């Protein structure tokens with residue numbers, strides 16, 4: 001009788017840790033959700049084949065409204081696993097599910113997996129230099145989200161890099177591209193006019209981290225806004241003040257304009 | 266012709282991903298470094314047994330000064346792997362190693378694994394709320410560094426959490442405990458008196474992330490400074506003002522005192 005929160009990693013079924021696989025293999029019941037992120041290099045079938053168990057996929061409503069009615073009851077008399085893309089507790093509200101587990105008398109354990117949050121390291125930007133993070137959300141009706149703009153502003157003033165998670169509508173199979181994020185940011189800039197995000201802003205795009213050949217690109221918005229970065233998922237990053245070696249990596253590995261080598265200390 | 270940067274994950278030999286393991290198994294030569302951090306829940310022997318390959322350990326000097334003449338020469342005509350605790354390229358100087366590979370005409374790929382940067386999500390603190398990160402270093406001789414204190418101050422001032430890495434003497438296998446970190450911060454507070462870290466400051470301690478039985482404790486410095494959090498490594502976090510959901514998790518899962526539900530929210 002136990003509940004395991006097991007991360008599946010960044011891109012495909014092999015991104016799960018050995019620990020996660022061996023534990024998942026011996027669980028009586030295996031549940032999972034695929035609405036918090038997108039694993040672009042695998043399928044439910046390949047995941048099931050790898051762990052050797054049939055996986056019951058749950059919707060956001062099943063989880064948020066009925067986790068304690070669907071999953072927890074089984075954990076009381078069996079070993080249950082709950083799979084999620086990336087790391088189960090990063091940029092999700094799944095941590096709160098551990099409280100529901102406790103209140104239901106069910107012990108829970110967490111098995112980590114590679115997360116987009118640390119995979120940013122492959123962009124060459126020092127991870128300790130990232131500041132507050134934010135999510136670029138799709139406007140809906142008359143509601144136009146903009147707080148993420150201020151996050152960038154706050155971090156940039158501090159010389160810190162800003163990680164921008166991009167929106168996702170799993171049931172509609174909508175995955176926000178870095179291009180759409182840039183478009184939205186320019187519109188917010190027009191309204192606020194804080195000089196935070198313009199055509200001359202340097203940005204970094206990372207697509208399909210976890211694959212052997214992820215797309216890593218850096219450059220000015222004016223030049224990248226219409227560039228094809230490949231299939232989703234994507235994340236957008238607005239660097240703050242760059243260290244010499246960060247700039248060198250962006251140029252050498254991410255194809256950034258050589259002019260950014262000349263940092264303005 | 267190929268160099269693989271493969272992360273070993275958080276705590277033991279099972280924290281490497283399935284992808285990481287299978288790739289390492291096919292490599293002709295396998296190198297590793299344990300100066301950035303150590304795998305406290307395992308040993309080199311156990312990692313070797315799992316990968317089924319002899320592993321050549323590299324010192325900080327081997328990597329920083331001679332990566333191109335120790336690792337790359339072999340990567341030119343063979344499949345070579347470079348193992349590092351956590352997620353590759355998280356350590357500040359590692360990204361630059363990919364530039365050396367490129368310059369030597371060696372292809373390089375990154376195989377991610379869990380990182381403490383994302384694993385701390387198990388503390389129930391929202392990942393997006395983390396600000397700039399820092400490392401607590403021991404004062405030595407006439408040198409008393411305190412920049413990590415300023416980092417806490419700037420983050421907390423903006424309602425952001427501060428991830429604090431604690432000093433490590435890898436070679437000597439000596440770790441700074443969360444207890445020592447707290448005492449140091451209290452000393453820096455007595456000197457700067459900026460109101461940033463006091464007996465009344467709420468902190469979170471995470472020990473042995475990655476293990477099935479990590480230690481997660483939250484509370485006021487006055488009560489945790491002499492508490493036993495178990496064996497290292499320890500990570501210290503100074504949260505900024507809490508979301509009620511973060512507070513509830515710290516109380517129910519981290520044993521935090523109910524008092525934080527009214528004082529730090």
Ligand SMILES: Nc1ncnc2c1ncn2[C@@H]1O[C@H](CSCC[C@H](N)C(=O)O)[C@@H](O)[C@H]1O
Nearest residue numbers: 010037086087090115116166208209233234
């Ligand atoms: N492999 C990947 N490549 C690029 N972006 C990714 C990604 N995986 C997740 N993301 C980004 O993060 C968003 C999901 S947020 C949930 C993150 C997840 N728990 C983790 O640990 O990674 C996506 O919409 C996308 O913007």
Ligand code: NA
Nearest residue numbers: 130395396398
């Ligand atoms: Na961070």
